[PDB]
């Protein structure tokens, strides 16, 4: 029974699975001396 308020309610997906809609990057300072660009996953 569609009205104005509920006119935008799409039908649900048939499998009832929502679509799913990275990794850390570190910039170690030079504070020998080395500047490391570090990529981490935890």
């Amino acid at each position: 029974y569609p009205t104005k308020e509920t006119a935008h309610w799409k039908p649900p997906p048939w499998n009832d699975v929502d679509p799913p809609k990275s990794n850390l990057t570190l910039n170690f300072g030079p504070q020998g001396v080395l500047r490391l660009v570090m990529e981490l996953s935890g």
Binding site: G29, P30, Q31, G32, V33
Partner: protein
């Protein structure tokens, strides 16, 4: 009068307190850093002077620029100096941080670390000997010893 004598006594008290616990920030750039580490050896033993070894740059009182300060490192050194709390002192190791030394005419070497930060004590050498830097540290302690902060504050 009473006031000048009292502020003189307080000035030498806080002056002894500041000069007896100089915590450094060592910049491990080049040869002169290895000479600093050999000044940290048990023979010379900075730690008996109230000078700790390898303190964090957020609590250090003095900074010793040991090595060549190139163009790629000067903003980092200026950032470190700006982060370090007041009062802050700078001691220059070697000819590299004095005036460039060997690499004075190189294209990517800052001709002296005085162009980036104010420098108090210049220690000459390539590398200066460990006892030479110890004498420079004692000279910095004597420079602190004759500071007149409270007398100038009361006179102003």
């Amino acid at each position: 009068s009473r006031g000048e004598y009292v502020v003189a006594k307080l000035d030498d008290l806080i002056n002894w307190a500041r000069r007896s616990s100089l915590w450094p920030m060592t910049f491990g750039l080049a040869c002169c850093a290895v000479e600093m580490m050999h000044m940290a050896a048990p023979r010379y033993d900075m730690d008996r002077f109230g000078v700790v070894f390898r303190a964090s740059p957020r609590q250090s009182d003095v900074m010793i620029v040991a090595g060549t300060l190139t163009n790629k490192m000067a903003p980092a050194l200026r950032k470190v100096y700006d982060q370090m709390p007041e009062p802050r002192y700078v001691v220059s190791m070697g000819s590299c941080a004095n005036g460039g030394g060997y690499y004075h005419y190189s294209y990517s070497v800052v001709r002296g670390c005085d162009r980036i930060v104010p420098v108090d004590i210049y220690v000459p050498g390539c590398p200066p000997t460990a006892e030479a830097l110890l004498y420079g540290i004692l000279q910095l302690q004597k420079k602190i010893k004759r500071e007149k902060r409270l007398r100038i504050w009361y006179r102003r």
